[PDB]
Design an enzyme around this catalytic site. Sequence first.
Site, short mmCIF file in Angstrom:
data_model
loop_
_atom_site.label_atom_id
_atom_site.label_comp_id
_atom_site.label_asym_id
_atom_site.label_seq_id
_atom_site.Cartn_x
_atom_site.Cartn_y
_atom_site.Cartn_z
N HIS A 179 -91.33 -50.79 74.42
CA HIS A 179 -91.20 -49.44 75.02
C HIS A 179 -89.74 -49.05 75.24
CE1 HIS A 179 -90.74 -50.46 79.30
NE2 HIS A 179 -91.81 -51.25 79.20
N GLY A 238 -86.11 -50.81 85.65
CA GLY A 238 -85.11 -51.68 85.00
C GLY A 238 -85.54 -53.14 84.91
N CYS A 292 -88.10 -54.47 83.46
CA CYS A 292 -88.83 -54.82 82.22
C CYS A 292 -88.03 -55.80 81.36
CB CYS A 292 -89.20 -53.56 81.46
SG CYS A 292 -90.67 -52.77 82.15
#
Lengths: 304, 304
Positions: A40, A142, A144
């Site tokens: 993503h 942030g 991820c």
Amino acid sequence: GFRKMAFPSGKVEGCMVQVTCGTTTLNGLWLDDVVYCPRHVICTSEDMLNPNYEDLLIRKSNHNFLVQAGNVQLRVIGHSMQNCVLKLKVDTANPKTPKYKFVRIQPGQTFSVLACYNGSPSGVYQCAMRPNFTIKGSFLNGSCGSVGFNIDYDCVSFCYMHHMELPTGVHAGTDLEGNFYGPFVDRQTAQAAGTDTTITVNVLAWLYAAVINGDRWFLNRFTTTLNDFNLVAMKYNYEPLTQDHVDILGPLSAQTGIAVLDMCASLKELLQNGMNGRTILGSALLEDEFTPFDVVRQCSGVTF
Amino acid sequence: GFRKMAFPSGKVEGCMVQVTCGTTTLNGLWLDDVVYCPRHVICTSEDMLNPNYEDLLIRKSNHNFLVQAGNVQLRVIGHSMQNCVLKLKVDTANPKTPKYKFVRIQPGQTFSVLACYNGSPSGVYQCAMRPNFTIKGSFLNGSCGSVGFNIDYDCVSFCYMHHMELPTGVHAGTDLEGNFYGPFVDRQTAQAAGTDTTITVNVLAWLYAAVINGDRWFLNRFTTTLNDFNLVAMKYNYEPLTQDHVDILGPLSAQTGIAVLDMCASLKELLQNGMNGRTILGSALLEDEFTPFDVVRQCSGVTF
Ligand SMILES: *[C@H](O)[C@H](C[C@@H]1CCNC1=O)NC(=O)[C@@H]1[C@@H]2[C@H](CN1C(=O)OCc1ccccc1)C2(C)C
Ligand SMILES: *[C@H](O)[C@H](C[C@@H]1CCNC1=O)NC(=O)[C@@H]1[C@@H]2[C@H](CN1C(=O)OCc1ccccc1)C2(C)C
Ligand code: NA
Ligand code: NA
């Protein structure tokens, strides 16, 4: 004398990098010449609703990917998609690459999370993969690409990479081959986790820890059967207990001189009667985040 | 969305060594050309009752000290005593020596413990220095010389080295200059910790975390004064709250739009009325192990 303990995080800290694509920044895992991160990262806000990831990845150039390893900008010489993960091939192998495996963990198993922001470690904590394949983590925007792992001997076993938060405030992510744990998809839509159940074998482990640590009030002089216990388990949304669970608890059973079906009878009474405002290992609730191995490791002092 | 998080432990892991003197093995902290460890390593079982450490150290030769850094045997070229710590000067500087400070922490402050056995890291967890200068740790035989630390920017602040377990099963140790926290002595005699009190400012921090994480039932429409609150605090063995405590909570106050004396009024009701079998951030007890800084770090995602 009994704490939620994470694995030492050094070997993983040396692998954490920053991956930026436009305004979108998250963490990556730099092993040999490959940076693994959530796919993503290639998404703009608008296309997170129902992204065609294949079409989005085609539009991307190596140069759209800003990968920093602290002060170093690391040159992406290739990009590929494996399920929900992006593999960014880079010109430099990580000289701090530890010995590692990618493993898919089972529901009920624990791991350490190294929570990162902008490719920098913030903190380390122990998690359980819930029966409904969620984790109860602490992750902000942030976070991820932050990873979950176990250490066996000198080997880091990566089992989790963080992708998303669900409506309930719990978290979902993938193995390092990019296969989601549970029914989740990497798009911004409302998604139901199952009903979650308590990890019965872990609650038993933790009651064994309580006994080892001199905390015994809840022991009773009764036994029970897998059959009869599982009837009460079902009623309190506890996972059923299998003979495998009984065999895994054998060492703690033998150490304490309390048969597994005797501990089960103690758990039965706690579920039916509550804790009467008493505490076990300084907790007012039954804890299910400690595996039998976690308990044995922490009471026998295993190292890495 | 809120976990007990340890600092990443990598920088400390590279400093942990094994220190053996006869049958007695514990951990050491290898910084530049010096290994810091508890002085009770020079003790035989019998002399732990009332050791004359000066006389014992005189009898010791460099060669009585077996210091291993993993596979490496590290050559002791000197020994000195600073309070309750032994400084073993070695021929090699630690090439993995991080940037560091030695700090003496205040009661109520938190730190990460890197629990080691035989100079190998087993695990990392967050601790608070209790008001009675004990810690509620997880330490077995061989855990001595394990260290507590904070990380600020790129600097490791060492604040704790582990020496002993008290009758109550809590733990005591020193700063890295070898000064015990609290009234404790490194000899095998029965020793009383004070009555311990709850760290009021930390309970307030954690209630602020609960609000930030949408968990608000306990908020009431009442205020109070430091004076009137401290009367209830005293009654429930909570530490008195100072204007310094109120000033430290200002950021969380401002973020949530809840005045510190309004949160205090909420805490008052919880102490007088219990939690009615409700939970706050998934706990049935009031948590006091999170400082205002810990809460702000974890809700704002600070890194290192
Ligand atoms: C990756 O850093 C990020 C982490 C989330 C954000 C807040 N807490 C987390 O764990 N993941 C995402 O933003 C993914 C992503 C899009 C939405 N999504 C997500 O988690 O949605 C919920 C959310 C977003 C922001 C703030 C709170 C909640 C896709 C592609 C699945
Ligand atoms: C150092 O590894 C060790 C750690 C203790 C042992 C069990 N849990 C701990 O935290 N420290 C000691 O053994 C010190 C030492 C002697 C006794 N002492 C101590 O902690 O006494 C209590 C104890 C010992 C063994 C097992 C349980 C309890 C001196 C010099 C203070
Ligand atoms: Na490039
Ligand atoms: Na020597």
